[PDB]
Amino acid sequence: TGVVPILIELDGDGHKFFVRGEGEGDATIGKLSLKFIATTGKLPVPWPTLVTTLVQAFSFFKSAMPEGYVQERTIYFKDDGTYKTRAEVKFEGCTLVNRIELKGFKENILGHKLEYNFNSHKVYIIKANFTIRHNVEDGSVQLADHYQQNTPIDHYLSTQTILSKDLNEKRDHMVLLEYVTA
Amino acid sequence: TGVVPILIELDGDVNGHKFFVRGEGEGDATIGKLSLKFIATTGKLPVPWPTLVTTLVQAFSFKSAMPEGYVQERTIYFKDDGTYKTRAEVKFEGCTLVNRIELKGIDFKENILGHKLEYNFNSHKVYITADKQNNGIKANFTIRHNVEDGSVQLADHYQQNTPIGHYLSTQTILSKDLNEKRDHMVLLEYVTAA
Numbered sequence: 001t002g003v004v005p006i007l008i009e010l011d012g013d014g015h016k017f018f019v020r021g022e023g024e025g026d027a028t029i030g031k032l033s034l035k036f037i038a039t040t041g042k043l044p045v046p047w048p049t050l051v052t053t054l055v056q057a058f059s060f061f062k063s064a065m066p067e068g069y070v071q072e073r074t075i076y077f078k079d080d081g082t083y084k085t086r087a088e089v090k091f092e093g094c095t096l097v098n099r100i101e102l103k104g105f106k107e108n109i110l111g112h113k114l115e116y117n118f119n120s121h122k123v124y125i126i127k128a129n130f131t132i133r134h135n136v137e138d139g140s141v142q143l144a145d146h147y148q149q150n151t152p153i154d155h156y157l158s159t160q161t162i163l164s165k166d167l168n169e170k171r172d173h174m175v176l177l178e179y180v181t182a
Numbered sequence: 183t184g185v186v187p188i189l190i191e192l193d194g195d196v197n198g199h200k201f202f203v204r205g206e207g208e209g210d211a212t213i214g215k216l217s218l219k220f221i222a223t224t225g226k227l228p229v230p231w232p233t234l235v236t237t238l239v240q241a242f243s244f245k246s247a248m249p250e251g252y253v254q255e256r257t258i259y260f261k262d263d264g265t266y267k268t269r270a271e272v273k274f275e276g277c278t279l280v281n282r283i284e285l286k287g288i289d290f291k292e293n294i295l296g297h298k299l300e301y302n303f304n305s306h307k308v309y310i311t312a313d314k315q316n317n318g319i320k321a322n323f324t325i326r327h328n329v330e331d332g333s334v335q336l337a338d339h340y341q342q343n344t345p346i347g348h349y350l351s352t353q354t355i356l357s358k359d360l361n362e363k364r365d366h367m368v369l370l371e372y373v374t375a376a
Contacts, residue, residue, distance in 0.1 A: 002187040002278060094186075094277035 001027065005095040006034060008054060013103045015044035019054070021176075025096065027058045032178035035166065042172045045104075046114040048134055049077075051161060051176070052146060053085050053102055059157070059182045060126060060150075066091035067153045078143040081105025090153065108134075108142045118161040125157055126150035155182055185210045187278040188218060190238055196287025197264065197295065199228035203238065207369075209279065211242040216371035221364050229287070230299040231367040232327055233260075235354060236339060237268045237283055243350075243375050244319075249274030250347035252318070259338040264290030273346065293327075293335045300328040303354040307376075310348050319343035349376035 008021030023034035036047075036054065043050075053073065057065065068090025075083035085102040108114060115135035123130050128148035133141045162177040190205030207218035220231070220238060237256060241248065251273025258266035270283040293299060308323045320342050327335035355370040 003185075004277065005184060091277075094184075 003028075006032075006055065007092075007095055007097045008034065008036070008100070009098070010036075010050065010054060010100040010102065012043075012045070012050075016040065017043050017045070019043075019050065021054060021098075023176075025055065025058045027062070030059045030180050032058060032176065032180070034176045034178075036174040036176065037169075038172035045109060046112055047116065047163065047174045048114055048118050049083075049109060049144065050102075051118050051163075052132060052144075053083065053087070053100060054176070055089060055096065055098055056157060056180070057089070057096065059180055061089075064089075064152045065096075070151045070153060071148065072150075073146055073148045075147075076145040077105075077109060078145075079106075080109055080142075088153070108136060113137045114142065116163050118163055120158065120160045123157040123159070125155055157182055183212065188216070188239070189275075189278055189280045190218065190220065190283070191281070192234065192238060192283040192285060194229070194234075194283075194285040194287070196229055196266075196285075197290045200224070201227055201229070203227075203234065205238060205281075205369075209239065209242045211245070214243055214373045216242060216369065216373070218369045218371075219359065219362075220367040220369065221362075222366065223364075226365045229294060230297055231301065231356065232299055232303050233266075233294060233337070234285075234367075235303050235356075235369070236325065236337075237266065237270070237285055238369075239272060239279070239281060240350065240373070241272065241279065242373055244272075244343075247272075247345045247347065248279070250345070251279075253344045253346060255342050255344075257340045259340075260290075260294060261336040261338070262291075263294055263335075264288055271346070293329055298330050299335060300330055301356050302328060303356055304328070305351065305353045308350045308352070310350055316342065316344055318345060350374070351376065 003024050003026045006023050006025050010019040017040045019036050021034050021036040025032050071087040073085045081104050087100040089098045130146050132144045136142050159180040164175040186209050188207050188209050192203040194201045201224045203220050203222050205218045205220040209216050254270040256268045264287050266287050268285040272281045310321050313320050323339050325337040329335050351374050353372040357368040
């Protein structure tokens, strides 16, 4: 019910970086509007690879609040490196906070030759296994196998995502619009 | 800080006429703006909407009382007509500010029940004065309601406040949702202190 504020903090790693996301969420319509900012400068990684790691609560995840849940993922990129991520999503003074730690390859990913977009997927829902198709600039696809577990402190989720850019923003950033349904 | 959701629930009972109103919307203390849609769930109101405006926050700009929120009790004398008696509790419920109100009306005549008021609300400054006696706040003010013929209906408000744990100027616009068939009131309000 209603629209809640969202804080997202991603501390990433031979290249250290930090991303802070701020925006609003509306569970009534299942809409996300978020702007992410690279505080440490340009990312040594393409933005679409951080999309999945960067709040399923908007459509268990809701019942987990306000003490919230822990989300851990290991993400294998085909013929490349892998992500390992741990996150804590919970409520802090009427604001939903997602604190994330991820650690990682060869220079599609470090090469920065992906397309700035993100295709829709059905997620098999806690445990989860799914594969994301990233569009590559040449025409090929970069596959990313996700393994996911959840823990509190049988259905599907379809998600649609739009990646855009704030024109009057000079820091490396990502504006994100997302619709997720059950 | 930020924009908070608002739930307003008023179970009312005037001269034999029971009614329930649910208001939903947003509040922003930073700019002092209220956006609310009120719905008469029990059907057409036995009372004109402008007479419920005062009773239906003041926290936006009352703030210190949250989240274990204050009690607001009012006695509202309509000139040569009936009177309102209201008790309300404004507080936070899961990040939402809720204003549950109980109102009762006695000794009316059929401006108010006659439904001959204008669908609008003139601005007023409210005289807010503190009182350590009841650990709360008191206020007295009179609202001039425009009646359709040309005259005015005056409504004398007496108000006390108390926690469960200067001036205020208000500006109000009353409108209607075109795609809403229930008896309702769209409300926009700007409130500042002095």
